Structure 1
C-alpha cells in the first residue's frame, strides 16, 4: 500500500492520465482541473499492489511547506510536459527542496512525461531528464493520456522501480 503524489503544472494533463491510467482506459475525460484522490488495485507477479494517487495544487506547483500536502503517502509521480520548460523545471525544483525537507531515504519516484503527441517538439531532452531521474534513482517515462498503451507501460515500469527503491529504504 503506497500512495503516489501527482505533481503537474496546470492543464498539463494530470486529470487526463489520472483517469486514463487508474482505469487504464482513455475516456472522453474533458472536465476542469479539480483536485482529488484516485486508486488502482492490481496484481503484479501474483503479488497484490494497491496504489493511491493525488492531484492537488494548493499553492505552488505542490507547496513544500504545510498546506494540505501533509498527506501520508509513500510515492511520488511528477508529470513533466514536453512543452513547458515550466512543468519540468518546477518539478525539478519542488523535488530538490522536498527531498531536502524529508531528508529521508529512497522513496518511489516516477518521472512521467505526459502529452506525448507534443513530444513532436520535445523541448526538454530525454537525456537531461534521464540524468535527473537517475539522480534521484527515479524512473523516466514518456506517455500520453490520449494513449493507453503508453500509460500501461508506465504502470509496469513504475511498480518495478517501486520495487527497487523499496529494497533501498
Structure 2
C-alpha cells in the first residue's frame, strides 16, 4: 500500500502537533509537549485512493528528512514572527532534498482566532513566490485540515510523475 512520508515544519507554537493529532485522532489537543518530535501513521482515502500517511511532527532541536516526500510549512496567522521564519524553513527543505521542486504547502494555522497579524494576501504572495498552494487552517475547528494534508499528497502524486 502507498505510504506517503509527510513532514510538518514551522516555528514552535504554530500548531504543528495540534494539526497532526487533529488529522490522526480527530481531536483538538489543548496541550502538547513542544519538545516531542514523533511520526504518526494514518490510513486515509484521498480521491478514492486508500493510502498510508506517515507524518513527522517536528519539534526542531535524519532517516525521515532524507526520505520525506512532502512538507507542510506552517505559520500562525496571529504570529507575524512565525511567518517571517517561513523562508528559513523553505531553504532547509530545498537543501535536505537537494532540489527546487519539493512538494510543499504553505499553511496559515489558528484561523479561528480573531487576532490576525498576517493577512491572506501576504501569504498568497509568499506561496505564489514559491509556486506552492496556500491553505488556511484551524487545528481546533478542523478548518482546511484535510485540505492541507490532501493537497500535499496531491502535489506528491504530480511530482512522482
Cα displacement (A) at 1:103: 3.6
> Corresponding residue for 1:55?
57
SS of the residue aligned with 1:96? helix
Q: What is the TM-score with the length of structure 1 in the denominator?
A: 0.77
Paired residues in the alignment total 158
Query: 5 Å matches for 1:16-165?
Result: 16-23=18-25, 25-33=26-34, 34-59=36-61, 70-99=65-94, 102-118=97-113, 120-165=114-159
User: What is the SS of the residue equivalent to 1:112?
Assistant: strand
Q: Please, which runs of 5 or more residues in structure 2 have no aligned partner?
A: none
Pick closer, same or farther for the CA change 1:147–1:94 going to 2, 3 Å: same
5+ residue gaps, structure 1:
60-66
RMSD: 2.5
Question: Is the alpha carbon distance of 1:27 and 1:103 closer, same or farther for their aligned partners in structure 2, counting shifts above 3 Å?
Answer: closer
- Structure 1 pair 72–97 and aligned structure 2 pair: CA distance change class (3 A): closer
CA displacement at 1:164 relative to structure 2: 3.3
Change (3 A) 1:57 1:156: closer
Q: CA deviation at 1:105?
A: 4.6
- Please name the residue that 1:11 is paired with: 13
Relative distance call for 1:134 and 1:92 in structure 2 (3 A) is same
Distance in 2 (alpha carbons) for counterparts of 1:140 and 1:101: 22
Match of 1:64 in 2: none
- In the TM superposition, residue 106 of structure 1 has moved relative to its aligned partner by 1.8
TM-score with structure 2 setting the length: 0.81
Query: Cα gap change, 1:56/1:45 in structure 2, threshold over 3 Å: closer, same or farther?
Result: closer
Distance in 2 between residues matched to 1:15 and 1:87, nearest whole Å: 15
Deviation at residue 142 of structure 1 after TM alignment = 0.7
Structure 2 Cα separation of the partners of residues 9 and 163 of structure 1: 27
CA drift at 1:68? 7.5
The runs of 4+ residues in structure 1 deviating greater than 6 Å are: none
